[PDB]
Amino acid sequence: GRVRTKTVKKAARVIIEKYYTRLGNDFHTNKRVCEEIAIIPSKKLRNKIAGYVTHLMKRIQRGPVRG
Amino acid sequence: LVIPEKFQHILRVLNTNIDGRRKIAFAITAIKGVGRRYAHVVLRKADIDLTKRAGELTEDEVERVITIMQNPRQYKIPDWFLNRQKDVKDGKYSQVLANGLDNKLREDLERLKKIRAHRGLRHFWGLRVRGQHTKTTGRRGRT
Amino acid sequence: DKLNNLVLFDKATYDKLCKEVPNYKLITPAVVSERLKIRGSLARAALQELLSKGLIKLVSKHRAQVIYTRNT
Amino acid sequence: QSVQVFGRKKTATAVAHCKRGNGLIKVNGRPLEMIEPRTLQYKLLEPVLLLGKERFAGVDIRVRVKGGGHVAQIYAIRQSISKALVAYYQKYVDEASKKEIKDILIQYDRTLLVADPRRCESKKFGGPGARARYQKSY
Amino acid sequence: LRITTRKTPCGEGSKTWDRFQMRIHKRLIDLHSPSEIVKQITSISIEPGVEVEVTIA
Amino acid sequence: QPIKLARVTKVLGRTGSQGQCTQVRVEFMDDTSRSIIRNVKGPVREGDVLTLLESEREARRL
Amino acid sequence: DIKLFGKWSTDDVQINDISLQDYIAVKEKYAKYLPHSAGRYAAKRFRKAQCPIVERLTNSMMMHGRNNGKKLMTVRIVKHAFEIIHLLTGENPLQVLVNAIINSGPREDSTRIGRAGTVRRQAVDVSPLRRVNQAIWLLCTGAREAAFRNIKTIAECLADELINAAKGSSNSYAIKKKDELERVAKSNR
RNA sequence: ACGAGACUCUGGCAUGCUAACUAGUUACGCGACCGGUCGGCGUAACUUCUUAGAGGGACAAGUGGCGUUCAGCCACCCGAGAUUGAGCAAUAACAGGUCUGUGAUGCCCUUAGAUGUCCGGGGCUGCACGCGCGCUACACUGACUGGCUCAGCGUGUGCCUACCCUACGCCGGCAGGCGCGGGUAACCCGUUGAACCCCAUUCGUGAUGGGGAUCGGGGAUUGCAAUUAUUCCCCAUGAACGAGGAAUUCCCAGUAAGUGCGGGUCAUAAGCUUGCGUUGAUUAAGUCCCUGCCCUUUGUACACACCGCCCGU
């Protein structure tokens, strides 16, 4: 099961709500910017939030995101 | 030495009849004490080729084997390698063939009951010698 | 149960055995034992003896798979 | 020269020292044609004759092995040989034939370059094995 | 160091065990110097739980 | 007992008391116009071809 | 060259099932000099068919709590009877192997079908993968029982069962099992 | 918001990096072949080859088919890795076991007539049988002369603690006597040379060699005290088992399974358990049957909650 929980989804939602311009286009840029401006204790969690940031931004190119 | 036709069914112990189908190093397992590695070692040091079969069992072979099984000191074999070391109730050192003389020694049930020994009473009822504890478990004997 | 097989040396290991194993195309101790009514143990022993005589072609040897084929 | 980059399978590993030598491949003082199981020699000559016995033109490859299990050493000794060939063929000589032989052995199988990450798991208590448990008492 | 201990004080229930593991990490520092200099460096309020064995040869 | 060809085009679902079979849609290659339903037993890949005794069989349908 | 064991040619096989070479393959590039590559196909799904079927054999006559963990013995015992079918039929063992896999491979089986009943069975089509699995299982069951307690050794009981299953002969235990499956498919429509 | 997740050790790529003299392969002869090959190793020695550090890496990130086009699911190329395994695990509760685990404890026998307590000489150490975890097998995919040779967690000389591992000479098949030493430890056994297998030996369908499972003697080391040779072996003893009814444990990847070594108990001790390696599948990537788990709807005269409530003679 690869369902992303509310922690990942909500942190990515807050990040894209807050630092929408600060984001990048590549996932590896996204994890670096996320680790710059977020107290994410561990590498795995910051990776997961970064990945959902990439997917949410991919969803941005075609329309709004509800949250 | 080598001869195609010497196959006989019976070896002489006390004029009784035995089996003679087994091969060499295994046809002399019909004796109570001879067999296992005892027969293997006597044939091994007998200075003969062991590829021979039951049919090539010569009378000279049997005679030499009988002589070697009479006394172990043919190749300086100690008595404990036989099933009977210094005997009980007599000061001998050898195993006796046939029946009625060796099996007389094995009956060991009354005299130990005279001294109220546990070994004699245990062998009196046919119980376990290795010491198998008996509480309820066991699937042999009555079913 | 009951062990009773041929242990006698007679006209069964040389005749009808040395005259029917060479003429067949597959030769195995089990095959020789089954097709020629002979004992598999003595089949192995005689096959080793005739290999020492040198009248077969050996591919490989094993405890249960000794591979022979006709050579002469 | 030491262009060795592991080459592994299970807990056993091989290091394929390579140099400009005679074209004879050695495995800790014994030729690859003679290994203790006497059964996996074809598994060892597979890479060389798959890519071509003509490739070795004066290259001395000594592989030193260490680990548990003979067959576990194999699939890594040959992996070490393939790694040493890759390192030699990447250091100076071209890549077109390198990519050709790489495609050929990659379609042949995958355990010539990339190691198997598998390993023996621990055993969990309350059972005879890691996943097997004792019989239920009625 | 592994110590696998049954959890229930009296044998009952499922066969359950704790696995207490003791990790002991050991470094060596061998320096070319008289031990008096190393002892001068030593008085630095060494961390508790770190034990020192002195080897001079 | 005529035998023709049939190849999978749609895995409709899993059937059976304990997941025994796959209700799958199969087309006949010799006709490439008919779709029938079969409770095929075993792992089935979308596009496999099998020789069959039956060309009209149907099973429990829902 | 990619000949099996370096002695049995691999550029001669003909499955003759129109489209089944993706589920029975000995020509495929995964087919190697030896049938030993350690278990890596069983992890995922539809990857089992990518196995070189020689490996599936050497692991299917590899069972019964007395053989598990003895795979080198299985590879020796398949070299045995490969070089024996090389002489018994005078042809490449791969041809008789594909004949056996194309005939012994079942088509119709009978299974319980329904959500509310338990009275009878219903005919079902056995997919190629399951058909080769159960055909090799019947072959190995016969080869075990044909040399079990018997004077006949391995590589000949297996050999006999393979040859009399490859030609379609019903004398084979595997072919009689196939006939039994077909008849129980007839008797449970 | 707690729980799940997240967390942490990690299994798995460090070819990049701090870096070993308790780690290790290659610049010249040590006993051999006109250039190749040694764990008594050659002068010279670089972190690739074992340990243990920091940072990195894997995210359904990339493509394709489905999807209320979403959450997600299924295939594919690269990649070491596209589900590595476990300890933590809720609110709330039990009349489930433990007063025979405890110097944590409640009227009765116990008020010194003290269910072991100083010393210590028997006791859960019994025989007719019912599917209680498991044990070696029924054989030729094999026990078997022996050839070759590959292991990983560990455990290890010490407070009323001899006894722990354990490199040779002599002897002794079997255990063991004295010594020069090796070990607080990757320095010592150790390169756990090991052990399963690598099939050259009688073996052929049996009572002999599958099956020591059923006899009496003897050397003897830790043990004042081996009486049911309890435990260290040598000879003889082949009973039963021809892979076994109905009901029926357990098992998806280095897994099941086969296989030996280690820790626990410990006079030196394992048919048990706990770890470790080694060898190592077709098992299906599904459904809820007949197994439990009570989630939603529903009925209730139950709420001590169906082991409820209750009617009548």
From Swiss-Prot, chain A:
Transmembrane segments: none annotated. Keywords: Cytoplasm, Diamond-Blackfan anemia, Isopeptide bond, Nucleus, Phosphoprotein, Ribonucleoprotein, Ribosomal protein, Ubl conjugation. One of its GO terms (molecular function) is structural constituent of ribosome. Component of the small ribosomal subunit. The ribosome is a large ribonucleoprotein complex responsible for the synthesis of proteins in the cell. Part of the small subunit (SSU) processome, first precursor of the small eukaryotic ribosomal subunit. During the assembly of the SSU processome in the nucleolus, many ribosome biogenesis factors, an RNA chaperone and ribosomal proteins associate with the nascent pre-rRNA and work in concert to generate RNA folding, modifications, rearrangements and cleavage as well as targeted degradation of pre-ribosomal RNA by the RNA exosome. Belongs to the eukaryotic ribosomal protein eS17 family. Component of the small ribosomal subunit. Part of the small subunit (SSU) processome, composed of more than 70 proteins and the RNA chaperone small nucleolar RNA (snoRNA) U3. This is Small ribosomal subunit protein eS17. The gene is RPS17.
Swiss-Prot record, chain C:
One of its GO terms (molecular function) is RNA binding. The modification N6-succinyllysine is found at K11, K53. Its main location: cytoplasm. The keyword Kinase does not apply. GO terms for cellular component: cytoplasm; cytosol; cytosolic ribosome; cytosolic small ribosomal subunit; extracellular exosome; nucleolus; nucleoplasm; nucleus. It is found in: Cytoplasm. Component of the small ribosomal subunit. This is Small ribosomal subunit protein eS25. It comes from Homo sapiens. The lineage of its organism: Eukaryota, Metazoa, Chordata, Craniata, Vertebrata. The chain holds residues 42 to 113 of 125 of the full protein.
Curated annotation (Swiss-Prot), chain D:
One of its GO terms (biological process) is maturation of SSU-rRNA from tricistronic rRNA transcript (SSU-rRNA, 5.8S rRNA, LSU-rRNA). It comes from the Eukaryota. GO terms for molecular function: RNA binding; structural constituent of ribosome. GO terms for cellular component: cytoplasm; cytosol; cytosolic ribosome; cytosolic small ribosomal subunit; extracellular exosome; focal adhesion; membrane; nucleolus. Component of the small ribosomal subunit. Part of the small subunit (SSU) processome, composed of more than 70 proteins and the RNA chaperone small nucleolar RNA (snoRNA) U3. PANTHER family: RIBOSOMAL PROTEIN S16, RIBOSOMAL PROTEIN S9. Belongs to the universal ribosomal protein uS9 family. This is Small ribosomal subunit protein uS9. It comes from Homo sapiens.
From Swiss-Prot, chain G:
There is a cross-link at K32 (Glycyl lysine isopeptide (Lys-Gly) (interchain with G-Cter in SUMO2)). The modification Phosphoserine is found at S127. It is found in: Cytoplasm; Nucleus, Nucleolus. Its main location: cytoplasm. GO terms for molecular function: mRNA binding; RNA binding; rRNA binding; structural constituent of ribosome. Coiled coil: none annotated. InterPro entries: Ribosomal_uS7, Ribosomal_uS7_CS, Ribosomal_uS7_dom, Ribosomal_uS7_dom_sf, Ribosomal_uS7_euk/arc. This is Small ribosomal subunit protein uS7. The gene is RPS5.
